[PDB]
């Protein structure tokens, strides 16, 4: 590989962080929900401008009740996929709290991509696309809606963030 980019997954529990990771790295998806244990790592390489970019994606549980995420989790990360569930407005409301967590524990120039996941539940949508997109605008973040289930935009989300990082 030519470059190794550490990118982390963050967002409320249940939003789809883990399946987003499995879909991108192993083209797999599981409907059985299992809260993530400790910190998980997955890798994948892609081509960007003729070069080979090794993407190292970090994943962890969204709940920080008894054990909160440290700067070590974020350390050296050049990218962050901040995820929420379009069907659960609460997970969208909490994005502000995650941005504060990034501000306090991650490099000030990290590339942050807001990800509205569970696109396939468009009929149960609680967070209008235009509103989220505008929000991403005002906060200087990239934005994209995905579906780890039907696979919509998953590759595009990761591909885009890595390219932005390049
Ligand atoms: N309909 C739909 N369900 C999805 C999608 N992505 C994940 N899910 C479902 O949501 C549930 C939680 O997904 P998961 O990937 O475990 O969440 P998480 O953010 O990693 O959760 P945690 O480790 O912080 S607790 C699962 O039952 C999974 O199958 C998606 O695009 N569409
Ligand atoms: Mg998980």
UniProtKB/Swiss-Prot annotation:
Changing residue 31 to A: Decreases SH3BP5-mediated guanine nucleotide exchange. It is a lipid-anchor. GO terms for cellular component: centriole; centrosome; cleavage furrow; cytoplasmic vesicle; cytoplasmic vesicle membrane; cytosol; endocytic vesicle membrane; extracellular exosome. Regulated by guanine nucleotide exchange factors (GEFs) which promote the exchange of bound GDP for free GTP. Regulated by GTPase activating proteins (GAPs) which increase the GTP hydrolysis activity. Inhibited by GDP dissociation inhibitors (GDIs) which prevent Rab-GDP dissociation. GO terms for biological process: amyloid-beta clearance by transcytosis; astral microtubule organization; early endosome to recycling endosome transport; establishment of protein localization to membrane; establishment of protein localization to organelle; establishment of vesicle localization; exocytosis; exosomal secretion. GO terms for molecular function: dynein light intermediate chain binding; G protein activity; GTP binding; GTPase activity; microtubule binding; myosin V binding; syntaxin binding. Its EC number is 3.6.5.2. Changing residue 147 to L: Impairs protein folding. Changing residue 33 to F: Nearly abolishes SH3BP5-mediated guanine nucleotide exchange. (Microbial infection) Glycosylated on arginine residues by S.typhimurium protein Ssek3. Changing residue 15 to M: Impairs protein folding. Keywords: Acetylation, Cell cycle, Cell membrane, Cytoplasmic vesicle, Endosome, Glycoprotein, Golgi apparatus, GTP-binding, Hydrolase, Lipoprotein, Membrane, Methylation, Nucleotide-binding, Prenylation, Protein transport, Transport. It comes from the Eukaryota. Mg(2+) binds at residues 18, 36, 59. Its cofactor is Mg(2+). A motif (Switch 1) lies at residues 29-40. A motif (Switch 2) lies at residues 60-79. Its main location: membrane. It catalyses: GTP + H2O = GDP + phosphate + H(+). It is found in: Cell membrane; Endosome membrane; Recycling endosome membrane; Cleavage furrow. GTP binds at residues 13-19, 30-31, 33, 35-36, 62, 117-118, 120, 148-149. The small GTPases Rab are key regulators of intracellular membrane trafficking, from the formation of transport vesicles to their fusion with membranes. Rabs cycle between an inactive GDP-bound form and an active GTP-bound form that is able to recruit to membranes different set of downstream effectors directly responsible for vesicle formation, movement, tethering and fusion. The small Rab GTPase RAB11A regulates endocytic recycling. Belongs to the small GTPase superfamily. Rab family. Interacts (GTP-bound form) with RAB11FIPs (via their C-termini) including RAB11FIP1, RAB11FIP2, RAB11FIP3, RAB11FIP4 and RAB11FIP5 effectors. Interacts with RAB11FIP5 and STXBP6. Interacts with SGSM1, SGSM2 and SGSM3. Interacts with EXOC6 in a GTP-dependent manner. Forms a complex with RAB11FIP3 and dynein intermediate chain DYNC1LI1; the interaction between RAB11A1 and RAB11FIP3 is direct; the complex regulates endocytic trafficking. Interacts with EVI5; EVI5 and RAB11FIP3 may be mutually exclusive and compete for binding RAB11A. Interacts with STXBP6. Interacts with VIPAS39. Switch 1, switch 2 and the interswitch regions are characteristic of Rab GTPases and mediate the interactions with Rab downstream effectors. The switch regions undergo conformational changes upon nucleotide binding which drives interaction with specific sets of effector proteins, with most effectors only binding to GTP-bound Rab. This is Ras-related protein Rab-11A. The gene is RAB11A.
